Design a binder for these strands. Structure first.
Length: 48
DNA sequence: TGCACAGGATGTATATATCTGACACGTGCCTGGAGACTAGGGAGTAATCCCCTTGGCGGTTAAAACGCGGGGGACAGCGCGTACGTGCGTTTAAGCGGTGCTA
């Protein structure tokens, strides 16, 4: 929230995929404009 | 005249008996149990060294799964033609028991 007020663009790095999914649910619940890239993202999708 | 029955004739289901198979009881011999000797294979013991999961984990991939189109494979109907089913008359040789040999 503070960072958005400042207009910053923040990265979150985590070791666990399941928490990545939890983060998806969290960000959707707040509706932050977010994107995901992980060990399963398609290569072309990774580039784009 | 034709019927009733007195006197007599083949037959036969009923009844009494003779003509064939199988099981139990008697001999008697190659035995089965038993006694003792036997040892070396089995079983008890002890490493020992090697192969089998740890355990879930992400980042990947190859195979599995799921969805769809469609077109042709399966298949229920059925026209019809015949070649197996049922039923003769007729023949063969398969079955029966018998006699004599033998390998």
């Amino acid at each position: 929230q503070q960072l958005k007020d400042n207009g910053h663009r923040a990265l979150i790095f985590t070791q666990m995929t399941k928490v990545l999914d939890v983060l998806e649910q969290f960000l959707n619940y707040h509706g932050y404009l977010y994107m995901r890239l992980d060990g399963a993202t398609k290569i072309e999708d990774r580039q784009i």
